[PDB]
Amino acid sequence: IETTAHPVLALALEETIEATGSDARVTGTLRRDHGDLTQLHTALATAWTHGIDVDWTAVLGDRRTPFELPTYAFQRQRYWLEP
Amino acid sequence: RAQARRLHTHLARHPHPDPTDIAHALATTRTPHEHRAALVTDDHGTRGP
Amino acid sequence: WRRRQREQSALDDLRYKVTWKPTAVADGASATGTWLVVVPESLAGGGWPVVVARAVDQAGGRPVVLSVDAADGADRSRLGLRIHEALGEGPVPDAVVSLLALDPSALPGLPDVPQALASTAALVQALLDLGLEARLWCVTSGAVSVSGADGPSAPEQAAVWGFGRVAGLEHPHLWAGLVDLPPEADERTAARLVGVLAGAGGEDQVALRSSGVFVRRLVRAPASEVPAVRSWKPGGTVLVTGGTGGLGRQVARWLARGGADHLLLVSRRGVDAPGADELVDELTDLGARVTVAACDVADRDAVQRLLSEQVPSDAPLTAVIHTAAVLDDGVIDSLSPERMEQVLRVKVGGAVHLYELTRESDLSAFVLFSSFGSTFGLPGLGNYAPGNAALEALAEQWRAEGRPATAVGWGTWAGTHGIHELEPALATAALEQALERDESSPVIIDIDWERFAVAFHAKRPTRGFELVPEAQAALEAA
Amino acid sequence: PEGLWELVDSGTDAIAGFPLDRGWDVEGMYDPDAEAPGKTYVKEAGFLYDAGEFDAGFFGISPREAVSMDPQQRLMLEASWEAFERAGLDPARQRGT
Numbered sequence A: 001i002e003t004t005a006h007p008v009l010a011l012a013l014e015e016t017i018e019a020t021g022s023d024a025r026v027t028g029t030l031r032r033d034h035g036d037l038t039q040l041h042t043a044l045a046t047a048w049t050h051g052i053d054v055d056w057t058a059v060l061g062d063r064r065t066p067f068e069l070p071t072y073a074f075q076r077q078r079y080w081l082e083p
Numbered sequence B: 001r002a003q004a005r006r007l008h009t010h011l012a013r014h015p016h017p018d019p020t021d022i023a024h025a026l027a028t029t030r031t032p033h034e035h036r037a038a039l040v041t042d043d044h045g046t047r048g049p
Numbered sequence C: 001w002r003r004r005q006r007e008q009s010a011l012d013d014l015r016y017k018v019t020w021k022p023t024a025v026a027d028g029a030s031a032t033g034t035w036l037v038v039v040p041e042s043l044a045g046g047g048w049p050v051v052v053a054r055a056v057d058q059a060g061g062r063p064v065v066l067s068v069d070a071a072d073g074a075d076r077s078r079l080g081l082r083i084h085e086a087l088g089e090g091p092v093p094d095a096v097v098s099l100l101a102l103d104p105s106a107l108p109g110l111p112d113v114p115q116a117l118a119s120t121a122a123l124v125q126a127l128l129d130l131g132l133e134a135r136l137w138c139v140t141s142g143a144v145s146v147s148g149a150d151g152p153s154a155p156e157q158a159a160v161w162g163f164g165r166v167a168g169l170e171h172p173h174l175w176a177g178l179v180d181l182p183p184e185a186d187e188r189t190a191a192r193l194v195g196v197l198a199g200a201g202g203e204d205q206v207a208l209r210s211s212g213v214f215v216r217r218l219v220r221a222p223a224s225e226v227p228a229v230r231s232w233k234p235g236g237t238v239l240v241t242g243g244t245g246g247l248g249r250q251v252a253r254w255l256a257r258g259g260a261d262h263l264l265l266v267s268r269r270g271v272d273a274p275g276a277d278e279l280v281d282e283l284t285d286l287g288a289r290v291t292v293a294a295c296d297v298a299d300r301d302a303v304q305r306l307l308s309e310q311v312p313s314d315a316p317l318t319a320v321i322h323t324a325a326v327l328d329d330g331v332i333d334s335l336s337p338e339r340m341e342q343v344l345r346v347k348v349g350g351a352v353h354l355y356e357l358t359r360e361s362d363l364s365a366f367v368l369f370s371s372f373g374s375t376f377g378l379p380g381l382g383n384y385a386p387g388n389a390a391l392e393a394l395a396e397q398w399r400a401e402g403r404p405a406t407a408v409g410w411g412t413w414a415g416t417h418g419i420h421e422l423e424p425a426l427a428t429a430a431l432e433q434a435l436e437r438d439e440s441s442p443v444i445i446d447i448d449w450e451r452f453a454v455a456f457h458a459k460r461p462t463r464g465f466e467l468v469p470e471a472q473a474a475l476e477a478a
Numbered sequence D: 001p002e003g004l005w006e007l008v009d010s011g012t013d014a015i016a017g018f019p020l021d022r023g024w025d026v027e028g029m030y031d032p033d034a035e036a037p038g039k040t041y042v043k044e045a046g047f048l049y050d051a052g053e054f055d056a057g058f059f060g061i062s063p064r065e066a067v068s069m070d071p072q073q074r075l076m077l078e079a080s081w082e083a084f085e086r087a088g089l090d091p092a093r094q095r096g097t
């Protein structure tokens, strides 16, 4: 994670990673002309997407209205014993 | 992709739900699985598309 | 005994039946892009059209309602121009929905053709002319009977279903499938319709009812364990149309070999047919009182007068066989309503007229010889499948009316890739077994699944032959 | 539950024909008389035609185990996961509770 106002070592880090056979991932915080809360939340979302356990309680508050969402989309397959 | 389509259909039949409540429900009350995706935007016109 | 056991086993090996497997309701998906809905002008905004338009509207797609006049639905060029102008200056269609099959009327000028089949043929070949890549789904109402709870299926929509079956093979990409609907429009049924219409594929031939959703599939139906009831002993005059033909000749000699009184053969030529004299010679040698005729069956006056005068008074008509039909081969690209009129004249008109002129005399049975193309469908049988499909619907109509009708499906008589020929004696014995088992719509074909299954799947992926274990074994083998 | 509400509110009858994919000889197990072994006079009844359908990979169950698994267990697993998700509870975080 680069904690700068704009990534400058992302290229070098990616070049080192791809030249090592490692599955590391590089992220930055802000970018040129993008420094509002939107960019910070974008960086946090990217970090979470790469698999960093971001504590969303701080970002989105402690408790809100319990909005209901659809359940998991199971990818079912048929399993049955033949006679 | 099925999750995204189901969420889109569910939100379509809803009278302007609060985006922050949806974000909190998705973040806290759902399991984080392997393949992940995120939508970050400041206006409620691009989230549907 | 050994011969009887072997031949009975072989006979039951080639028995089949069409049915409607219930299946789980698909979750559905979003209706992506624009969908072109085409509706008859006679329906206007009534029942099904407005509700399906609303359903696709809430499905995420944009409906394009296009009312079409009944006369406009016949010509392919005029219909294609109508599609082009209605859809012009806009995105190409992602899919096409055809409600044109819902009109229960006949084409003016060609009274022995239904407006539905002609309109569907015009629509599909007009889409071929325009070169659009959209997938075509056609919806019907009261076209089939998933179970006994349904009313009897109507003829014209069954003909449309057969036409769609044959069209799906020669044009896999253009033709997607068919979805029957209940008689009454409803929002829930429309929602399920748009859900299935947006599916990926495989569910080609399906039907929607208040009970649920069903998929047409073929199963085995051996008659070894079913008891025999009302054994076939025709005593009176037996009317056979097209007796001078091949199948008619075979059926006539089968009738002669046991339980023959008077074989009233009817043909366009009659005596002039190539071998009528020899046929009547053997039939008389087997004790049959043959009486051939020279008249077209479609002419109501001709068959009415023939029944009036040519029927002996000492032998009322009990059994009637319909196996006469002109073989006008044609491809989907070269179809025209006149050709369907010529093909559908003999079969449908003769069956209807024979049924109508009856009902004053009791009938032991009323047999109809539908083809395997009605059940499976084969490339090139465009002009020929719909009449065979309508035969089953007519038989179902009369069975509901309370008459002894039969719609036996036939394969290839010994007198293609995968389908083997049928012997005269074995086929006749199978027909006997079907009649004495009271089969409303039997299917009598023999096929080698090891080649036919893989060939049919290569022609088009389908899930029709799912309940036959041989089909699954052949599919997994390849 | 929303599907059940849609069904009952619309007054839809869910009774339908027997399943054909379960190896039942449905053609040869129907006769009208009420006294015969192995035969029944009922044509239709409620069924789950997707009863055998199950997402084995989600719960870490191999296909061979799933084939030799009771459909009741599979349906109960899926329904319990759905119920926990609908309650606002993450089913994964209920571990050890």
Ligand SMILES: Nc1ncnc2c1ncn2[C@@H]1O[C@H](COP(=O)(O)OP(=O)(O)O)[C@@H](O)[C@H]1OP(=O)(O)O
Binding pocket: C241, C242, C243, C244, C245, C246, C247, C248, C266, C267, C268, C269, C270, C273, C295, C296, C297, C298, C323, C324, C325, C326, C327, C346, C350
């Ligand atoms: N409308 C009709 N009325 C009477 N006979 C008809 C008929 N349409 C077809 N046929 C007969 O039914 C016969 C069809 O049997 P077929 O052996 O000739 O070919 P196939 O058995 O493949 O249909 C036709 O040859 C024709 O013989 P005639 O033209 O001598 O009658």
